[PDB]
Design a binder for this molecule. Structure first.
Ligand SMILES: [Mg+2]
Ligand SMILES: [Mg+2]
Ligand SMILES: [Mg+2]
Ligand SMILES: [Mg+2]
Ligand SMILES: [Mg+2]
Ligand SMILES: [Mg+2]
Ligand SMILES: [Mg+2]
Ligand SMILES: [Mg+2]
Ligand SMILES: [Mg+2]
Ligand SMILES: [Mg+2]
Ligand SMILES: [Mg+2]
Ligand SMILES: [Mg+2]
Ligand SMILES: [Mg+2]
Ligand SMILES: [Mg+2]
Lengths: 176, 109, 199, 135, 138, 44
RNA sequence: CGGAGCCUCGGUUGGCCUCGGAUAGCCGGUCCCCCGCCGGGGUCCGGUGCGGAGAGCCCUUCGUCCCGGGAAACGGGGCGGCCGGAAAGGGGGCCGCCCUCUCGCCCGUCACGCACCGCACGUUCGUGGGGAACCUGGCGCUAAACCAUUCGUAGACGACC
RNA sequence: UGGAAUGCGAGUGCCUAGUGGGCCACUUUUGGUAAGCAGAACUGGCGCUGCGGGAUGAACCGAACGCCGGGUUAAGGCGCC
RNA sequence: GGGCCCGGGGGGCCACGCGUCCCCCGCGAGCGCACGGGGUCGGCGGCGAUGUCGGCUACCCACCCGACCCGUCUUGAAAC
């Protein structure tokens, strides 16, 4: 899987193909984060196969649909439990993020895992994603934004319109 | 009286890195530094204007040393406002870095 | 006609990249105060870079090149030459469209200087990063006219200060004059404000 | 391009001049007038692709353009040579110019600084870029 | 040295993006780069916005962090940020910028004539003020 | 792209296109009237 | 120093005549206060998504006629003198004149100009650079280099003294 | 009811040149410390083959070639060259 | 929902002769416009006898991109 663009959260439900032994095999559900639904079903079959004696040939997808963020206008803290392969082992991490959507938080995890650990998306398994209250967060990067009277300036604002104009008479001012 | 044409530069021919298509010229137009601003200049006439030793007939005038190769803007090139132009004859390589007149006709405004 | 640039507070390679593309399109460029140009990284690791360049020489005849120019202007010039196809007539024509100066000699001392915000150090570097000064680096690899250029640059700044005070004087009169003739020019002041020229 | 619109001619000896658009002839060419007394552009045909239509408009809805002013009216007549043959302004054209001008000219003078605007020529200058400016 | 702070209620001008030219209020801070903003009286839905596309103004509305859009609008109307904004030189300079941009060819002609005459009158007066200052020197 | 070429291959296409045009114009006329009423309702 | 032209070479198609700089800070007024050979610091007051803004400024060209209203009258155009500039030096400003105009700008009045009958290389910088000549006036100049000879502080020959 | 899908016109006979030094890569693999070493399997290449990309390069990556115009791409790229 | 969108009590149909038997209950005329078996104008302008018009290619020159010297043996040649 390529963690392309902003991921979506998919609810994938699958089961073993019914057989005379078991005419109604049990139903399984997973939370999948993927770029599109085609990738979402593919990853499902990759995960259930690791937990059950099942695979695409001997099973079917019963429901694939996007789970929509339920409070897209409310800031939340997300705890993420993931495992990943490094160059020389596997590890379990717990990570935290602040975001408005749970799929946005998961995307941050992939970019972050790529930035800080050079971990490609194909080597990352998001085990669990929870919304966490400010009092249960652990990472100081997230906790410093739990301040009702938070304030801070924007020092040294760099000129981003550096080629409009490309040549000017006045030098830029970085203080605002 | 005054100028009635926009100022352009003959930046170079159409090319990859090691192949050159001389039938298309890349033009840089003064003040046009993005692709969304090139829309005004599509289809407008272009003139490489120069002087030679021998006299030649001037439409509406008497023979002089001025000569012109006509062309027109055909499409935008890139993201920063370069346009592709085509002329009745491939531009001479000595024209690279020199003025190309871009006329205000055919008017669409 | 001529694009005059001020090299103070510009990073060496970003200025060269823009300048090289400009003279290849047929524009004349003058860069003054090449000793005021900057390079990212601590001074020491940039001095080692030029000393490594200084060691490059034809083992059988050093006089045949490379030629290691020591002036901050010539260092910049060679850097723009490295971004041009200078072994072809088209590149050499462009290279002749560029003049480089230490200090600001006439006539550019009495002309307005433009900058390139895409090459300015205040824009392109993080403020905590170290950087080198082209003039100091040049002075410590054999450049001989650092002390003189500074001496003449201080004379120019003294004269430019008197010129600025004269211009501020002529601007204070300009503002006063607009009050004296406010009645007579009020109508023409409404046209300009109606169309955004005056706020 | 609506009747009464001011157009900037882009070609011919009258290039850069600002003229008043009267009507579109059956051939599709436009009919315009300077008027003559303002910029020495007479009743003359012009092609629309070669004019810039400004946003300035006078109301010439009450102007009665003579009906004989047609494509055949403005078509060039051939002149023969064996030295040179010179074009002459027929007395009818002068009469037609005055009849149309006498109705447009008073309406131009109704708008302040418009007659002077029509006397002045269009040109591009330093820093002025056609794609940026409104006409 | 800092005078404008990213805080709850700060009104920020949006310089570029899909909402360029509008005013929004900082409702909450997500992380170092993003904030929850709201434009109830300026046609902006509550959403995340980076600080990069924001320019802080001098107004600071008083509502609790993450209060719903009803109370952001209520504070906006009490402070009359819309009319106060239009009275600032910052807003006026924006207005002048767009007035000049839309100038028609005829408008540009009339400005040239007005500017032509206005500049001559000022120059003549400056000449007289210079000559008058000369006599005091003598 | 060419209408009369389509009708040579599928004459019914003319019926479908005429119906679409009439339906779409009719649905637009409702939305404006709905919107116009709402705006008038707000003015009250 | 002060006429017609003829070749040839090209490009270009308004100008910006200048503080120094800072960037976790800036810019302009303010001399009332303190220093100095009119300049610096303080105070105070203004601006600061720079508007005393290069996102800018200046100039703007269809021409002429007649007569009005604003603007000028300390004004426009034109021969003599003194400061002044050296990093690669100023056809800027100032003072005299005997002259030369009430027009230069803005808003109007009034007409006229090849109005060449829709059409390109138009419009400058342009008395442009270089070359032969032809005139036509004034004021000025009347040299050296190399060879040859000689030298031997030099020398394969050239070169060099 | 020409008895699975899909695609495609097939069968057959004479005469016949050059070749019978190869070499390279993914994977498998023998000897060897290893070798741009020697020796095998499979497929694909280079040899016989230009062209875009890998600065440069037999074999890598893309793609295979009549003489052209327009459009769009692959692999690769987009500070300047 | 499906049944020529089953049966009964404002808007589009590639319905539109009839004698009937009854399931059920073989040729109208003209005229015209065209998104219709691949472009035409029943549209125009300038210039021309001593200095100008056209002349691909060819002679010379310039510039931009490309470009290693052929034959040969060879797995491999621009090959030191
Ligand atoms: Mg010319
Ligand atoms: Mg030395
Ligand atoms: Mg082997
Ligand atoms: Mg062989
Ligand atoms: Mg083969
Ligand atoms: Mg091949
Ligand atoms: Mg390589
Ligand atoms: Mg092609
Ligand atoms: Mg490259
Ligand atoms: Mg090459
Ligand atoms: Mg051989
Ligand atoms: Mg061999
Ligand atoms: Mg060979
Ligand atoms: Mg070799």
């Amino acid at each position: 899987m390529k963690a392309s663009g902003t991921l979506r959260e998919y609810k994938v439900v699958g089961r073993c193909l019914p057989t005379p032994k078991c005419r109604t095999p049990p139903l399984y559900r997973m939370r999948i984060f993927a770029p599109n639904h085609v990738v979402a079903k593919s990853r499902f079959w990759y995960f259930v196969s690791q937990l059950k004696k099942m695979k695409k040939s001997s099973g079917e997808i019963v429901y694939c649909g996007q789970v929509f963020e339920k409070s897209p206008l409310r800031v939340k803290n997300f705890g993420i439990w993931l495992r990943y392969d490094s160059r020389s082992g596997t590890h379990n991490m717990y990570r935290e993020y602040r975001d408005l959507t749970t799929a946005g938080a998961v995307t941050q995890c992939y970019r972050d895992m790529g930035a800080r650990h050079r971990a490609r998306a194909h080597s990352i398994q998001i085990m669990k994603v929870e919304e966490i209250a400010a009092s249960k967060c652990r990472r100081p990067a997230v906790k410093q934004f739990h301040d009702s009277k938070i304030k801070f300036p924007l020092p040294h604002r760099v000129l981003r319109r550096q080629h409009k104009p490309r040549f000017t008479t006045k030098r830029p001012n970085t203080f605002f | 009286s005054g100028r009635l044409w926009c100022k352009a530069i003959f930046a170079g021919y159409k090319r990859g890195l090691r192949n050159q298509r001389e039938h298309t010229a890349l033009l840089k137009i003064e003040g046009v530094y993005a692709r969304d601003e090139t829309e005004f200049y599509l289809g407008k006439r272009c003139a490489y204007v120069y002087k030679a030793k021998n006299n030649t007939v001037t439409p509406g005038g008497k023979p002089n040393k001025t000569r012109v190769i006509w062309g027109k803007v055909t499409r935008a090139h890139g993201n920063s406002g370069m346009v592709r132009a085509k002329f009745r004859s491939n531009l001479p390589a000595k024209a690279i870095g020199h003025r190309i007149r871009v006329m205000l006709y055919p008017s669409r405004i | 006609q001529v694009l005059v640039l001020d090299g103070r507070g510009h990073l060496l390679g970003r200025l060269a990249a823009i300048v090289a593309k400009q003279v290849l399109l047929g524009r004349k460029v003058v860069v003054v105060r090449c000793e005021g140009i900057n390079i990212s990284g601590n001074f020491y690791r940039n001095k080692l870079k030029y000393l490594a360049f200084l060691r490059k020489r034809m083992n059988t005849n050093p006089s045949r090149g490379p030629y290691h120019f020591r002036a901050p202007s010539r260092i910049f010039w060679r850097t723009v030459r490295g971004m041009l196809p200078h072994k072809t007539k088209r590149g050499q024509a462009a290279l002749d469209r560029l003049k480089v100066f230490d200090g600001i000699p006439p006539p550019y001392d009495k002309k307005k200087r433009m900058v390139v915000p895409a090459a300015l150090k205040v824009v392109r570097l993080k403020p905590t990063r170290k950087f080198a000064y082209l003039g100091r680096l040049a002075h410590e690899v054999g450049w001989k006219y650092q002390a003189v250029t500074a001496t003449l640059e201080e004379k120019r700044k003294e004269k430019a200060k008197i010129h600025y005070r004269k211009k501020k004087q002529l601007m204070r009169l300009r503002k006063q004059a607009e009050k004296n003739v406010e009645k007579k020019i009020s109508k023409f002041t409404d046209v300009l404000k109606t169309h955004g020229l005056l706020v | 391009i609506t009747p009464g619109t001011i157009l900037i001619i882009l070609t011919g000896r009258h290039r850069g001049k600002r003229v008043v658009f009267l009507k579109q002839l059956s051939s599709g060419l436009l009919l315009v007038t300077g008027p003559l007394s303002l910029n020495r552009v007479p009743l003359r045909r012009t092609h629309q692709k070669f004019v810039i239509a400004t946003s300035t408009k006078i109301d010439i809805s009450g102007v009665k353009i003579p009906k004989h002013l047609t494509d055949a009216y403005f078509k060039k007549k051939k002149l023969r040579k064996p030295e040179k043959e010179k074009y002459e302004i027929t007395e009818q054209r002068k009469v037609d110019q005055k009849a149309v001008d006498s109705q447009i000219l008073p309406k131009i003078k109704a708008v302040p600084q418009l007659q002077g605007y029509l006397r002045s020529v269009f040109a591009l200058t330093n820093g002025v870029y056609p794609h940026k400016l409104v006409f | 040295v800092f005078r404008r702070f990213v805080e709850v209620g700060r009104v920020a001008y949006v310089s570029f993006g899909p909402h360029a030219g509008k005013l929004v209020a900082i409702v909450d801070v997500i992380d170092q780069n993003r904030a929850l903003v709201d434009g109830p009286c300026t046609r902006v839905r509550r959403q995340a916005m980076p600080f990069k596309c924001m320019q802080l103004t001098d107004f600071i509305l008083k509502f609790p962090h993450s209060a719903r859009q009803k109370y952001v609008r209520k504070a906006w109307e009490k402070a009359d940020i819309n009319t106060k904004w239009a009275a600032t030189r910052w807003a006026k300079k924006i207005e002048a910028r767009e007035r000049k941009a839309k100038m028609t060819d005829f408008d540009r002609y009339k400005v040239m004539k007005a500017k032509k005459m206005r500049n001559r009158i000022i120059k003549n007066e400056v000449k007289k003020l210079q000559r008058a200052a000369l006599l005091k020197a003598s | 792209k060419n209408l009369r070429i389509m009708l040579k291959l599928n004459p019914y296409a003319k019926t479908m296109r005429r119906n679409t045009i009439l339906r779409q114009a009719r649905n637009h006329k409702l939305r404006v009237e709905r919107a116009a009423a709402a705006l008038a309702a707000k003015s009250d």
